[PDB]
Amino acid sequence: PLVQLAGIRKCFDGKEVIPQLDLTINNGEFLTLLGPSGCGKTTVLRLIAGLETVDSGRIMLDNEDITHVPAENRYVNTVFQSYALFPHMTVFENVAFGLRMQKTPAAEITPRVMEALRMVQLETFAQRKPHQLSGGQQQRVAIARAVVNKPRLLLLDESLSALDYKLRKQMQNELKALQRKLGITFVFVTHDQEEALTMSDRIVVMRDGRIEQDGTPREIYEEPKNLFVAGFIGEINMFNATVIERLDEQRVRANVEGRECNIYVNFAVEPGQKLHVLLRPEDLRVEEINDDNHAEGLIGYVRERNYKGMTLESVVELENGKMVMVSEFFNEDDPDFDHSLDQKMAINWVESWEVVLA
Amino acid sequence: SPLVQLAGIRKCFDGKEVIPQLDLTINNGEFLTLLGPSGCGKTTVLRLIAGLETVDSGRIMLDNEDITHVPAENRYVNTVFQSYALFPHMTVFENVAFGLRMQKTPAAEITPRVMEALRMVQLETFAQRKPHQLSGGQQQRVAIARAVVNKPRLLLLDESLSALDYKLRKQMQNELKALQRKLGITFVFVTHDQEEALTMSDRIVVMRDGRIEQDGTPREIYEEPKNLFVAGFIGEINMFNATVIERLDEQRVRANVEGRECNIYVNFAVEPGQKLHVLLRPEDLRVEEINDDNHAEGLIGYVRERNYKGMTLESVVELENGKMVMVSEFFNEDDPDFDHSLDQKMAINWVESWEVVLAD
Amino acid sequence: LLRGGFMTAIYAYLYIPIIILIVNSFNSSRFGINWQGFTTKWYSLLMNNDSLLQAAQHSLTMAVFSATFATLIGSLTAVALYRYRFRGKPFVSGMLFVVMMSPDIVMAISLLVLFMLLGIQLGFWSLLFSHITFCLPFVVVTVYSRLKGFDVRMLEAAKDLGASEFTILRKIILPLAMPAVAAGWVLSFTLSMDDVVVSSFVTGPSYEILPLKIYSMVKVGVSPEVNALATILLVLSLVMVIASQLIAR
Amino acid sequence: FQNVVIVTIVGWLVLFVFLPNLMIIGTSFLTRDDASFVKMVFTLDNYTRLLDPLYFEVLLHSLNMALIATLACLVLGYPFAWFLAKLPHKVRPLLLFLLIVPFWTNSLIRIYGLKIFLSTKGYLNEFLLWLGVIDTPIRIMFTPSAVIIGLVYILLPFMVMPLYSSIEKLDKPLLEAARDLGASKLQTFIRIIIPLTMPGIIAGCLLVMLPAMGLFYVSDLMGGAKNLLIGNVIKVQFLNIRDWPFGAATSITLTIVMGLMLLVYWRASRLLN
């Protein structure tokens, strides 16, 4: 139990951004906060970092109250999205700023700074102003500056947004390895589903200052709680279904998008209840119908095939007028799924590979 | 039928020859995309085609007319900029009607043309609203509408959708494809994204350092690269080293690939002791799990990373030699869920005849 | 609560001399040290005074002409620097920056010796050139700073849309620079009216200006018509600045 | 169109600024004449007269009064700009325009008005005595103190404008980073804000110091005969004594200071950019 936030309230210009937040952060884990742009994630990060004071509530770090402790006494460092890098100081002095400011004896300052630079592979750039480096080198300098003070928790604020698509993939693995070797908690904020999903051990989804769900990526991707989460991350398909009658403890018969199949439901239902059926594009089966025999699934059509190389995703427009957007893979039995335009199809799913909400 | 033919074009800039030599032809009625790394000179080509820059040599013809030295005021070519380059003090209506007014179009026809052009992009309501009150998507819509009104023979796009977020960009990609089909004119697109270029284009030209590297259909580019730069530039690749021992049959050659023997498919002639390049994609690898001396055929490696993406699982396997191979597996088949450890010993195979063998 | 006190004190420092001259304009005492009633005799004495009125007219005319010419030339130069790209732009920026960072006495003496060497009588023309020359840099800086906040590729985009070089200027660039030109006009007007050293050096006796007449008359003794004259010019100046604001919008 | 403006703007500055200065610099090489005021005779007699204690104590006495005015402006100007950047954006343009409005009155008339306010029998002496704070009137006229008050009064608006531009262009997250890393406000001021805004300080010091060394009507009205500025000496040598070559020699001692200050601006700007 590292950080406990109890009953935190915050008001900005008379508008409430954090109504009431209770959240616990364990020790030695990589935690990512996910949500849309401008939903108070930055406010929470700045509250933990100490740049602002709560309008109500309590903050506990290691069982010692830091609610009113100034920003000068906390053992937490932050890397900013602006990549704050004082332009009139060399890399050596940039890293050593924090050590000089804490009145450290001078015989240990040089080795600590040099080891911190060697940690992030910056041995050669000892004396270079923060305008002669590249974006990745700037990222490494910011990380080394933050972690040179031996903080008890590192805060990252939208760290790798401004780089290309390849260095990004390199430094994702580099950050996960740095976190594992150091062993300290990492808190990450991103608007991208891929980074949060692929980099974390626990994900917290935020919306208007409230927590929607907190759990491991498997749970959040496979077992959402509401229609907003199931669709905010990844791609979802919304089918309208009306329950008719119950077959057994798990299966129920309903009218889904004008057809009648058997869906798996594990909670009590009554006839006439309007339901929601959610499906991932990869969780859908499609077959061509060239001959006159059109049956076994929703009919639909084909409006646009956007191929992607390793896969091919196609969107199907039903008779009612809703896009379906299926996706398929290239297998040995299925080398290429070359579809024409405006070609009639058949829609199917995999039994029990669906989630039904109320 | 050819529409634009670039013959022997040369360009120099500040004593550095950005474009040594480029020969190219653009057909009429297709969606063409120019792909390359950032800073290779695509924007310079785009500006050269538009007419805002001049060639040191060569000829440019449009419909059998030499427009090499015709000023950029009579060509039927319009360009859409990335920041929308919209006049802030005018309205959307005036922004659209600027080109028409400067061409002395009669006043009884200007208003219906402007109105139908705005309706073609679904901006009927915002005719009289100033800029700085529009979102990014609305600004792209305004820019496209402004470019299209003059009925050009060539609409030039310059990294149109770089600034938007993800979902809006994905929707507007299909919107642009549909609009191109509706109009019937050649679209030329310049982009750095791989999936973005692969999704829309009916024909791709990859340029590097002023030279054309490949040109063809998206399938033709994704599956049969001619060299390593194009193969690694688009998509993800697994580079494999092999040494040829002897040839077995007309499509099978004995080889020593990455430390072990394997039969690969090679059509061209080969000689013993030669070095070849084996190129594979992550989804092409078949990988089993060696728990306790089970299915130990193929390469031997250890897992150093595992990534869950929700629809597929990506794995980084470390061989005994020390080479990192990227493997991707999908959950769509009949294994709903599975998950690997961080030090497991794993076996690597691949399906026959799905190789891409490159000499030298 | 203590932030506003510091701000008020500086303003009181900069306005008290002004407050003294308006009140002393309505005072009855010739010396003006104390307050001995209310009168308007000084206004009547000023209205029948000819040399003072001529000096005021000459100063106002010089200010107006110099402001117009400086505004025009500076706006054109800033547009030229903004619109074109060449190697020497930092060099031109340095010349303007250095000429702004120049002492007044040295500039006055340089123009004095230049006019004496060429053989031009000192008077209207020399004063006009001096005021435009030392008013240019501020106008250039203001208009350029305003213009640099807009994208430059906008002009080429308009060019693709079918606009000549002359048409872009009237239809596009000018409406985005009008508040800066007007702002540069008022700033140029103010500087050309508070300068003393160059005018006191580069002028002659054919053209008499207001600073010289008051400087000559101060030694014997300043009657309150000058106090009366200061407040008349302030009201006339308060209506010229507001007219500029109305026209640009 | 393209070439006309470049030639014209270059032609105007050269014809009216740079060429006349080189003659001034070369006007101290010739001798004195009672006709055309010059003669082609290389001489260095003008300079050795500068080292005369009579003409050397005046130069030193002028620099002391100009430095204190610059420091008083800097102590009073940097905080003034700091409070202005912490105000609502809708009132900032109005307050800047309220600093230039005293300029609508001639500079020579504003100093004369200040003389009556601070006189011995005038206000600030009757009012300060009427509400007991002092027992006898405070006499500052015809003293070096009086001159410093005048220099600050006229030139104060020339220092606020350059500082506001430099202060307003600072990066807010940059200053916030030090607070997180563990720097207090006092420590943040010395090691971050000042080095970043140094080019603003240097530019502001140039616009208030050099003009303050040539204003001769301030000393004439408020200083007396013992407290003179370089502006009073040069005016006499050109209009009354008509000794042009010596006046040009005195002016270079003022231009030399310009060269020293310009180097600091470029190196402080080059180090930052």
- Treating each run of at least 4 consecutive H or I residues as one helix, how many helices of chain A? 8
- Provide the β-strand percentage band of chain A: 25-35%
**Major sheet details of chain C:** none
- Largest interface, and how many residues on either side? C-D, 64 and 70 residues
Broad CATH class of the largest domain in chain A: Alpha Beta
What structural class should be given to the helix and strand makeup of chain C?
A: mainly alpha
User: Order of strands across the widest beta sheet of chain A?
Assistant: 6-7-8-3-9-10
**Main sheet specs of chain A:** 6 strands, mixed
* CATH topology label of the largest domain in chain A: Rossmann fold
What percent of residues of chain A adopt helix (DSSP H or I)?
A: 10-25%
Report the CATH superfamily of the largest domain in chain A: P-loop containing nucleotide triphosphate hydrolases
The tally of domains of chain C stands at 2
Structure overview:
The complex is a heterotetramer, with two copies of chain A, one copy of chain C (249 residues) and one copy of chain D (273 residues). Chain A is α+β, with helices and mostly antiparallel strands. Chain A has eight helices and 20 strands. Chain A has two domains: 3-232, Rossmann fold, CATH 3.40.50.300; 237-357, Beta Barrel (OB fold (Dihydrolipoamide Acetyltransferase, E2P)), CATH 2.40.50.140. In chain A, strand 7, helix 5 (167-182) and strand 8 (185-190) form a beta-alpha-beta unit. Chain A is elongated, with a radius of gyration of 26 Å. By secondary structure, chain C is mainly alpha-helical. Chain C has two domains: 1-39, no CATH class; 51-248, Orthogonal Bundle (MetI-like fold), CATH 1.10.3720.10. Helix content of chain C is 78%, strand content 0%. Chain C has helices spanning 3-25, 41-47, 50-83, 89-100, 104-118, 124-147, 153-160, 165-194, 197-202, 210-220, 225-248. In chain C, 35% of the residues are buried. Chain D is mainly alpha-helical. Chain D has a single domain, classed as MetI-like fold (Orthogonal Bundle), CATH 1.10.3720. Classes of the chains: A alpha+beta (358), C mainly alpha (249), D mainly alpha (273). At the A-B interface, helix 6, helix 7 and strand 16 of A face helix 5, helix 6, helix 7, strand 15 and strand 16 of B. Chain D: Belongs to the binding-protein-dependent transport system permease family. CysTW subfamily. Chain D: One of its GO terms (cellular component) is plasma membrane.
